[model samples]
Target: AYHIDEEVGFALPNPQENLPDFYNDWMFIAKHLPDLIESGQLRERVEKLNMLSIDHLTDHKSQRLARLVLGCITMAYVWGKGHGDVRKVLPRNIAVPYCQLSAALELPPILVYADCVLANWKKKDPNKPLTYENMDVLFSFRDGDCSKGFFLVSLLVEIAAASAIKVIPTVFKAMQMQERDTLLKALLEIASCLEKALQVFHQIHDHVNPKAFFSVLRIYLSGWKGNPQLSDGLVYEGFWEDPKEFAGGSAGQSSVFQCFDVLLGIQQTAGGGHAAQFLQDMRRYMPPAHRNFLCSLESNPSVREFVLSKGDAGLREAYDACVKALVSLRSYHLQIVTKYILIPASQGTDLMNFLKTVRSTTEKSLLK
Candidate 1:
């Protein structure tokens, strides 16, 4: 253990002092994709050799390498995917921060990190080179799902990115330096790719079934903007806002549960919004079909009379109360958090206190 005379590496003329970790180094090399293309023979040989190693290696070795690669790429994409999903969820407030974060990283460092991680593997161990089986397994890990921690990181990164672009030039300039450019480019590309995938996912499913999408959004807003007055649990609105009256049949029978149930039920029964009839009707709005689905629904005797009747309007109002209450709870989140209730000059402390009380009292009274 006390052998300070040991040396590693073939070209250790002057021993290195501080080498970046394997992950960072791997990302560094991956950034120079053009260089990789130029060295066709080396790259080709590496691939071919890795393929051979996989073919001959045992399952564990292959899995190891595979997991490494997957971890690298998954880290890249999930970071981006989570941000884009939030943007799609709330374009107005949240999307702004997301865009700012994407703008922070240039692209190079990301690739640099990818390169760093890839370099950790050995050609052989215990007289045998690492097998392709190990690599395969490592790649599988890369494909793993994003953890909750990843989401938190996404939030932090987005905020940091926004700050860099909006205010801190010294930091921004540091990011722009050539040395860090590779990492930045990789990050931008990876984030962009994830965002595009999100777009595709939404195109296919968001409109057809938005229940899950909206549910997550409720959580996101709970961070900085939760105000019981503003959000009455639009998804689970009445549960938090009303208690007794919402429990059973009454004048104020809150349909929070019923509305959400209906939301999910529509996915099963109401043709999932992609029903042939809806699609056919939607076609009228394209090219020259010139039909208004909203108006059509408004006019449909069954939907209009049953769902949009005067009584239905009252129900909608009640439902909205719940949603507003939820928003209020989230807004309260803001007050409790930043912990600085420096109310606007126009809105005195009395007003702020009153506002908080109203939301809290309303929420408590509603929970039957």
Candidate 2:
């Protein structure tokens, strides 16, 4: 069964500060990551550390927190001071436990969207709503302001779509029972919910500085795969002899689009410089449960099939509305991506050069 929570949607709810007293070391690093990196002491701090056992934190919330802390810390360490200075090897002390937690969580040992947003936020006033202003990141890299804004905007979209996500189960049941009215109602709810996501999506511009995101923050989110800086990939010191490359954490990794597409039966680009395939591979980066939810949707009977067969005008219109809402979100997202990434990238020498180098090697990746 696919379990989408009422309060938080796909986001992990009420992730706590408590961690069995043994993981204060990780908490310290995660809490002060920005200051440590700014002072040129982040790697040194992690280096003087012992690898604690992941087994001690048995609860799900704590494990989610650990994943965020460790994921951010690892990315900060590897991509320290931007693309010029890159560390290809993750020392054993940090490597082992990260992979241990990675295994438990069913996520790749990278800073995926699940760890970055879903498990990374805390509300300023728990009593209030989870708006962009009230939410913030639990861990951060150098550009804390930009990071907070970037992360929370995505969190807000997840919150905005919660109502729609909750309707998915009803849609499934209605489809199974051939309950046309209920199915139409759920589809309409989803369309409206998805349209609301657009309102929150554009707020990324307000929070993130396009130039700062490109010049300062974006590198930390990068992965070893198709990256000019770390072409050989990262070594998890004691875990494996061969280096492993992973795609960078990008908006493409978010589960929001996948859920909507699966529910509405919107087929994606099958061929690309491998665009759609890259998206399919991005699923490897999602949390285990979240990934399972998408899988469950695939197994469920198609909503599109039901709507098409009914020949009812209302049902057909509602289905089309759901599909239209998805298009608006995806198209608008491309504009944001162009504004934040492509535009700023064109203006900077370092990032521009990085892209040039990447393009030369990647005459073969994401955007054709």
Candidate 3:
């Protein structure tokens, strides 16, 4: 209930204003949700539970399950029933599986288990609906307890995940397969289709900059650092060559840091005082990073504004958090790659322990 009330205070009031402008959606969803949740420090509850368990099962299974379940409920509630045009804005290729994944755990075998459950339930009565009442507890972790605006958390998490894939090729790897190629193609097609549905702002204006659009998109599709299409002659600088770089590593090879540099540069040079210059704010240029930064800064507005804006605020702190997360993840991947590829095995469990701690922290946070 406290979480529910907190979400309402933070999320719903602006949906009416934010929905139309997709950039705004990115701002709130990426930046706001995680900041709010993490600020609560609900993860401490799990740590307390961790003290009781010897096998780490409690942390991994129960707490992890709660995080995934809460995230799914948040998704279901945000794009609720009877929302006709919701899918129009967010396509089926993305929305459907993403929603399903949010409901599922990180493990693949869980999917097989879920299929068995669904099949067995269907065999009981072919005509019967799998309503909440008949569903297992895992599927309805917050059935009656869902809050109105609590769905914000799910939406933000989804945005963060999707935005992450755009800049980080590793995020696109589902299992060991690099399905990023197929996934990126589908995403671009959907984005192009959705562009037309936007309400007419100009009688005849090229809001859709062909070269710039394709160039920015190239960053997603190929991880191509060079895009001749960009008139400004700048491109995303994300991706890491050696895995061991961390904390204050140079952005020369790391795509993650490069992305931060790219966005921050664009925000300052291109997007500055240029809000009304473009048909739509080129904020999309910085949406992933900007949103997270703004949301996290709310508690420390002066610092956030100094970093992200001159004073124009609405972008969520969750978005900024996503950027920080991706940066941290980038640093992490660097260490693994460096050790496995560049460095020797002597790094030992120290590296493994670090990775383990990061993952455990993430899993625990999700549970909260």
Candidate 4:
């Protein structure tokens, strides 16, 4: 099962310190990625390096860190020139071992939320609690705290949803048993929890500079899917015969929001349009256990209709507030994309359709 706790909350527990001493050679290239890419030397660095094998890494934490490391390396190599300087073929050094680890994890061989936001952070002070104030990103695309701020704020939102995540199984059981009091308790908790989660999400403005987010950091987070630059898709030299296209990193990929949608019975899905289908395929990028954890919620009886059938004022209020809180969160998210992604792209920052396409999808996310 998925072990989400106070310390880790969908993040890798104790995100490993080193990937074994034999794998230590990658430490330099992975840590200095922004510099290496900025110097136009990341591709050269990756090319000359020996292809490390994933055979020795025994644990999930080490594997996850390796995925985070290699995942960023691939993105850096592909998007090194900021925009259209895309690479068609990635050399065996990064591609071979990356796909090996990617196969083991059941995630596509690309940068995803599990590799970036979920397993990417470490505490500023290990002794302190794992709050946004106490954490920072382990890997980065750009220099300074802008990348750190963006990744950490994203993790902070995951941590914010932790309480509601915990109550999920219990809420389902209550619905199955027709326990009114127990159902209300769980529902009310998530209502309050998501409201607080939105406040934590608002911290992104304080943390990430919208201009830097649009021009600098957001580039590295991009995938080859919809970008006009890499329209044919990116290829891993020897590992894949056909080229692959994957969506860039976005909050839509996060399981926390999917859980909210499932629990609340929101019907907006991949069927809406191509954009919604784009959002739906992001599930393929989620961590396997986390993805299955979300699956259980989908199969379980929904709390939405359960509350509606109860015909109790207290239950109805709890249900309404829960759904409203989710809508409020989605509404604020549209506001965020508007500021961080849309406004700049509108001002002719990059003028990529991928930018506007992603920004437009968030507006209609509010469920009826």
List lDDT for all candidates, in order: 0.25, 0.78, 0.26, 0.78
Rank order by lDDT, top first? Answer: 2, 4, 3, 1
Where model 2 places Cα greater than 4 Å from the true spot, the runs are 1-3, 269-273, 348-368
Q: Which ten residues in a row have the lowest lDDT in candidate 2?
A: 359-368
Question: How much RMSD separates candidate 3 from the native structure?
Answer: 25.6
| Residue-by-residue lDDT tens digits, candidate 1, 238-329 | 12232111010110111111112121112111233322233233222121111222223223332112223344344344334433433343
Model 2, 1-368: lDDT tens digits are 34467877887788765566788888888788778888879899888889798888798888888888888889988987774887889988888999888888788888888788887888889898888767778777875448888888888888888879998889998888878889889989998988999888989888998888888778888899977788888998888788899887776677887887777665442445344566578889987777899888877887877777776889887887777777677667757767888887667354344333323322221111
Which residue ranges in model 4 land beyond 4 Å of their true spot?
270-272, 348-368
Q: After superposition, how far is residue 222 of candidate 3 from its true place, in Å?
A: 40
Off by over 4 Å in 1: 1-308, 312-314, 329-368
Clash totals for all models, in order?
96, 0, 32, 0
Rank by TM-score (best first): 4, 2, 3, 1
| Poorest stretch of ten by lDDT in candidate 1 | 244-253
Instruction: List model 4 lDDT by residue over 259-278, tens digit each.
Output: 77777766445466655565
lDDT of 4: 0.78
Which of the numbered candidates is closest to the native, going by highest TM-score? 4
